[PDB]
Amino acid sequence: AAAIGIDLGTTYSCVGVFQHGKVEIIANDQGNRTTPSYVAFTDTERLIGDAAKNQVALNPQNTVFDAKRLIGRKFGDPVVQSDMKHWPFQVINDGDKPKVQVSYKGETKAFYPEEISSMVLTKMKEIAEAYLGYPVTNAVITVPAYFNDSQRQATKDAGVIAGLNVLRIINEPTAAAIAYGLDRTGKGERNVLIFDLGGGTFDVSILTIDDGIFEVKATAGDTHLGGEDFDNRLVNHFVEEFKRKHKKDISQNKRAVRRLRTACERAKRTLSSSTQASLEIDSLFEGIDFYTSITRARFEELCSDLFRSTLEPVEKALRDAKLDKAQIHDLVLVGGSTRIPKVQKLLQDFFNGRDLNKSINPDEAVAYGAAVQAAILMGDKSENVQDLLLLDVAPLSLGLETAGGVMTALIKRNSTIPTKQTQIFTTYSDNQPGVLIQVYEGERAMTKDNNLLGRFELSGIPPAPRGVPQIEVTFDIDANGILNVTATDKSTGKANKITITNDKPTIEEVD
């Protein structure tokens, strides 16, 4: 039972566990891997996840969600003031630490945002535990890259309230890069652009990865751009339509609008795989059955500026990172809203047709990375490296035929693998343009008595007297015994290779 990582968002969250080289992303009670960052305080119990989201229209005044905007902030913080004007619940200046007042079991208790998010984390904890069949406290929680230190501590504390051992707080874009394997090494010295288009926010972050070591070069964003306003444009389409079609002003009924919005969310998600989606609500407003539709093209028109504006922070991030388009090697998507074809088309066209990394569901990639990181942090073994080195060795020395018909070993018998070993060779005779390397396995001095594994030619060698050209021959062996023998001439940079397949007295006298 491995450590887990939790993707703690403003509108949604997701938990995964890392094991057997992969992260298993875990479904909630209804089969949903990603569930809402909502807690509904009712007079009987607090519902968490889909259960809270499903009743926002009925109990919005007591349902608390998007705790993150308030977490780690002071009551007087302009952000706090900006968001409290948008909530159905009351935000309270309890010592400049904004609390939310909702009725729980009949009492108008003020709940601090860290406990609201711990309620969410506790639910995510329970989801992963039910799946894994084991209680789990070892965890990584992700946060936006822009979070400051009061916010990071606040996130750790929400974890502690929930009973978690917070191994670490890591950034959302780091986790995505991890999820896509950009930290597996051999992919170093690359720039990664992460496009984080979520529910209530949009962020862009440019990372540089050097063989597993990360640096963040730049960030940019729009703190109010995300799926929620794509939903609001779809809502205005349907709300104004309803009113005009029926001469009934639905916009004034918070529940009817929320039912319409829920349909907007469903239709929009459907629309992203489709070309068309519909709205079908019985008795939506004043007993009126509202049946209508949205096409993909209409959706894009409604939201045409919301989509185009996502590239403005892209240009900003590139400016801050001092990078041109050509300097981004890896294009990465984060957030369910990037599943809309228009987003993919805009980012991909912006970067001249280059393919986006869509290999992991955008809403799972962050949790995925957190889970991988949680597993290494709980104890630093992650399908490597010491077992590979101690269990698998080169069973026979590995080397090459050299002049004289003899074998020169570069990898010694029973040496641990994976490993890379080298030696310097020159052409045997004078003024040759290249060399012939015969790769062998075995313990005999002569090559005629060894196992020929394969042969290759190293070209690009300036002719010079014997012993002058400097050729480095490398025996590069992986964990499974596969051998790659390469060679290069250090004076020209030219190289070639062969792939070898796997087997698996006087002093006592006087005068």
Add this chain to the structure above:
Amino acid sequence: EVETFAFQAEIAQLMSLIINTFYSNKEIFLRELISNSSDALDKIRYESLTDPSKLDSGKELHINLIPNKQDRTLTIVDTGIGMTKADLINNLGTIAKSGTKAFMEALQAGADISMIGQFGVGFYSAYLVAEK
């Protein structure tokens, strides 16, 4: 009425080592006591997140240092959770035997006294400079 208790052997030995071993880095004295006060302050702060009444006895969580040279003394005040009679008796609230034994083994292996806090027995370092 004053109750007298024995120290558990692992710590009776630890305190002897602190006093009699010639450790030069006496400054860890203050470092460890301040650090331990921080832990106590967090214990309340975390409980106050689900049970705010823990702060009803005093909302301020802080560390005070107050020297009084004329009495050869320094007071360190931890406004954190504190200890009940039972915790004071039970090794000032720690797992003294497992922590200290592992530490003594670490010391036998060449560990410095500065590592005492890494075993959760950091407060016994008070005797580096304290008479009492």
Add this chain to the structure above:
Amino acid sequence: EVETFAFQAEIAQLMSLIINTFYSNKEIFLRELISNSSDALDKIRYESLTDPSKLDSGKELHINLIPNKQDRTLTIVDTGIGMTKADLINNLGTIAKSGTKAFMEALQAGADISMIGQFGVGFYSAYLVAEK
């Protein structure tokens, strides 16, 4: 028939300090065991100067070192005065009750473990390499 006496608290304290100190110059182990053996041999030599009958239980004055790898022990035998039951039980016949305390003060001041023989309690250094 095993009679238990237990140890003087101050010497028990020194043994704990020796055992738990990271001391590398363990060669003092044999130095002190030999020195003490020598002292026993000189004391009998002096007794024989006024009372020669003390040599009729053996005359030769020597030290025998016999390593026993198969037992994981080292045997050191001296043919000196020996110890009475009383000396053996009274903290091994030395004034350990004085010497270990004085040594510990020296250790508090920065003295080395190798100075233990200067306090007449050199044989407790056995525990640097011995468990028993």
